[PDB]
Amino acid sequence: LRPIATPYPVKEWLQPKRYKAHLMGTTYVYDFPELFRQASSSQWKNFSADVKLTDDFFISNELIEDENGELTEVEREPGANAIGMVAFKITVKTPEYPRGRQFVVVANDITFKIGSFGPQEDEFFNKVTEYARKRGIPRIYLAANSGARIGMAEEIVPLFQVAWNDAANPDKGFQYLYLTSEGMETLKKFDKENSVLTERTVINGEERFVIKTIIGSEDGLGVECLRGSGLIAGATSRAYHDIFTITLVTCRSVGIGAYLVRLGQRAIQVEGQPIILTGAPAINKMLGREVYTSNLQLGGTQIMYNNGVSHLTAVDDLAGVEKIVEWMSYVPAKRNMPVPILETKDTWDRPVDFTPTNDETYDVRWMIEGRETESGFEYGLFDKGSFFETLSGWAKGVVVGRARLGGIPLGVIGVETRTVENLIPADPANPNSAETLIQEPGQVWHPNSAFKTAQAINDFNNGEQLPMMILANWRGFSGGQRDMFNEVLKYGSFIVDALVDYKQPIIIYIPPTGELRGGSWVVVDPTINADQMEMYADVNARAGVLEPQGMVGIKFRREKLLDTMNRLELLPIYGQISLQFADLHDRSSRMVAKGVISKELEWTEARRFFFWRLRRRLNEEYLIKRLSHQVGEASRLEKIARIRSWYPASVDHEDDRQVATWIEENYKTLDDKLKGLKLESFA
Amino acid sequence: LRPIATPYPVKEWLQPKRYKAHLMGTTYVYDFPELFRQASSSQWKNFSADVKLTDDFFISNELIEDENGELTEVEREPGANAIGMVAFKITVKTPEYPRGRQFVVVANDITFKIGSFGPQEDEFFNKVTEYARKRGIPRIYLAANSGARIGMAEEIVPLFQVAWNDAANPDKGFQYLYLTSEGMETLKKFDKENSVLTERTVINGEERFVIKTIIGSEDGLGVECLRGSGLIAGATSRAYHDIFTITLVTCRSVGIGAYLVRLGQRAIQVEGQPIILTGAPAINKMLGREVYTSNLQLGGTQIMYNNGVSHLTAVDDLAGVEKIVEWMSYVPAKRNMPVPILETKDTWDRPVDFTPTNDETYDVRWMIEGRETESGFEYGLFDKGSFFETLSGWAKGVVVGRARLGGIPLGVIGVETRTVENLIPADPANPNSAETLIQEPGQVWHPNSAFKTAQAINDFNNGEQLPMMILANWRGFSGGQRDMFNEVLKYGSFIVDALVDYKQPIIIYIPPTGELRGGSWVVVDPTINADQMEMYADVNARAGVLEPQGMVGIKFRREKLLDTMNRLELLPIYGQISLQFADLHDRSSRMVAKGVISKELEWTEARRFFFWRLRRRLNEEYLIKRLSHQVGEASRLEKIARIRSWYPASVDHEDDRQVATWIEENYKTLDDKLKGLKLESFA
């Protein structure tokens, strides 16, 4: 029956599927929309405590295929899903988009054939990904599956005969399995003839039908489930470069299940829910020993999060939905919309408080989001409380996240100065090899931190279409035997490749007590992508091919030191003079002189400078992408030149705030100028 | 003087630079063209022994910048190069292109300021890469450098004063370095005022000029060399997706030097010549100990070749040039030319001899290029002697290379069945951790072998623009703790991403005794890229979500076994029956039935089938890329449909040889059909 007497209807009773979901440690799939409403609601409470919300601020519409396989909206009792894949079209008004924003949600129904992927679920999953891609809408995937669906032609077990050699004795084996003329018959009546492929062969009595291939009448048993998974693997590969994609592992993901998680890139893993290719039982059978205890060893957060496969971990489903909603607040409503501006209590016009000290360790996060101190709060470069760090459990040499600058969304990459104690666990499978601690020195790229940088750059660019700033501060890549053997060169090159691809404005800024040297300057120079990149150096930063020590150890050897004394025992001191002699070359003053940076800057005035610089550029970019929808394009150069020709003569092309201000005051006026350019965009 | 009396002029004497190159273990840069002629000459000798060659079969033209910085051809004494970068435009008649083919050659002149990269060399290197990109011509780079150029303002050493605290005592230190009114003067006469940035400050006597920033009058000292390197890093990043790019490490490559090697991807390393980021000396200074003996430990072939950073190793320069020339024989003359067909003694029309045996180990290479045996030679699938394996020292679980099928160029990927004994050396830097042997089981993707597969797919597609065949035979990816911790998921996804990008025809073919299971089928299914991929399975191959054992261990548990006995102690035997029951599901007959493969095939007849299938498709593709240069394109579907509508009614669209034959007989006729389609490609 049902729990005798509760205040309201017993949900798990009305729809038993709900209880089955819960028993497996996951939210019932039809219950997730309520999770997004709750999260979307909290989102508002944290933005403007007062604002009174209404249920019509959030709308969830289930999507199902019609007579024609086309997606349409329906409202129905939860649990009517005929397949094991479910989808929702969600329209919600949020702080960044008060008038509303949409996105789709697809999820494995863990209660349908165990969340397995059959041909039907796969084509549905694919049909939804396209629905979203066509609309430029984000695709949120909720993974709670058991991998590809596995079958066997059950209607052949009961009726199938062997072909024993000894005619009546196991041991000697058999020569084939077959069907009598009786078997074939049932397969006739129950119209399942095509279940097998056989050859007629009367022998030692009467006609025997040798089975040459078992096919099965029931679909979803083998290779057809493999066609479907590859279909969505590629679908997901394509979507990632097309719309914002994100996956939340909610109970477990297996097979294409784990692959769908990675292919969509951005991932949030709920503690305790595994992402695996093969489970322990199976692996143990192979290995022959009881080497793996649970699946959490093969793919728990300790692996996938320390991995970088899982961008974030979540204590429970709702927390995972909260991360998604919060991540989405930095992303455009649909492909190619301007990035979602959201100004908050923290206004742009202010100095930056926290400042690093040449000698004294700090947390780069403090420079980004600010720091709380006994004597008040010290704001960092970005808006108070806007820093949303991601991939925080892997390659901690680099910190990456989204943040706001005067309300402007942008990807942020900073350098971790504190050494990292990466503790690499031991693998059971190997009788004996134990823990291993890898010391990762700060301000140095390693194979994993270089990979993370490339990854961050790509994730910022592909669905988020966000601008980016890199507080460049690396001494270079590690040249040790291990790091090279481990391909540090491949991962470094990934960075360059990613900067070439970047479609939004980029700011590279060497911070107050930081530096950029040979190995590291190369992979982040403005010329790698003149179209979008710009570089700025702090007045107190340093930059040169070699650090002073390396440089002195080559162009100020003792011989030259001595002749120096000669012109005016005393090594310790002079050795220092040489050091400082070099250091005088690595100043922003020289960078400015040599034309390698756009401007040298003062940290405490950076927030003011960058806010307007970025605002001005976002405005110019938008204009370029209008002359582009002309009919006879030309170089980015010809477009920016002609757009700047439209500026009033008195406007200083060099004043970011003026330019941004005049542009926002003439959006329509500028739009007219274009219209009457069209009739000149035919010939 | 010179070696007193030799038969002919002493080369190393006429141009001392030559001797300096040789002393450093490398070929003098102006001598490389002769290496390409020698190699190009050998190439002919191995193709058609008789053919009489003439010096005009090969032409080398040095390229230098003119008054306008534009590249032009010149003929001049070797050693006149004013910069440390040199380039050649090479036109050579080869077996695949008897009428001639071109390509450029750029090289660091190891004898010019030690092969350092100054702003001039960098802009020259970049100007040449573009020259090539614009022409769709291959770019061969010869790396023999010392990294970014390092300087110091030497004209400030002699004349610079300190500011001692004790007025006359090292220890107490100084407060700044400065120049007298005398210093400033010399800087005036020798017109090098801008060499420094100072502030006037009379003190305790008379005007002192505090140096706030040393700039230098001589260019090429610091950050400006960093701008240049990043410029070419990006230039090389772009070129790789645009033209065939290849690099030969000839003496050593440092800094952008190592990065240029990777960025261009394809690389051949001469034994003994290091590719490094930082040298040992420097690293030891940091670490404080004498941990690294030579540079070969940081980047010799044992690291870069076992790495996959170096595709091939070469015993000496000429051998490296031979590999380049041989690699280039599979690549088109310029971007978008049809792949270079080269038929040889081994005609297509023949059966394939070598065949694997279900139980008995073999070398997959034998299936590819054939095998030599006591009782004659047994041809494999591809042309005898056409298999050019690459990346052969890294991730040996996969074998990759170029080969010919009846003279047709194509990338080939096979699966190594024999277990691999990957011996991971110990790193010195770490007081104690020794060798480690990683056992890599066959027919299983691992992080490194999956990476190699993706890499191969990308390298085949980007400059080589080659078709490809994958003798798919993997049991799946490794699900162990280590392999997952090591991101096997990221590298697997790289494969999918690479198949999505493929622009030429693809053939996925499960070989005679091979298989494709769940973890592995997913990442290589035809739907990942319906436009170019096709899948075929051998009549003796197997495929299913799980191997029989895993499948029995789920849908044929004892309960069901027993009831089976019941319908007809005896476990060993029945257990087998269950196994075979499953195995009957994994047949090509079912794949064909379920519509997941294009055709099941017989190995010995494969060469005949694939040759024509590929030939037919190359012909159809070329036609699609003509309707494309229409004016109002549509789906690939609409184009192939209309092209097939042009075929004569009696032509069987399913007969590859007929179709290929009719198409080659009507190239011009088909070309007319298009012309008079143009007037219908306006409205």
Coordinates of C-alpha atoms in Angstrom, one line a residue, chain A residues 354-355 360 365-367 369-373 376-380:
Chain A
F354 CA 44.8 44.2 -2.3
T355 CA 48.4 44.4 -3.6
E360 CA 55.7 37.8 1.0
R365 CA 42.6 34.6 -5.7
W366 CA 42.9 37.6 -3.4
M367 CA 44.0 39.8 -6.4
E369 CA 38.1 38.5 -6.0
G370 CA 39.5 40.5 -3.1
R371 CA 40.3 39.6 0.5
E372 CA 38.5 39.7 3.9
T373 CA 40.7 41.1 6.7
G376 CA 37.8 45.5 6.6
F377 CA 37.5 44.1 3.1
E378 CA 40.1 44.8 0.4
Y379 CA 38.7 44.6 -3.1
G380 CA 40.6 42.8 -5.8

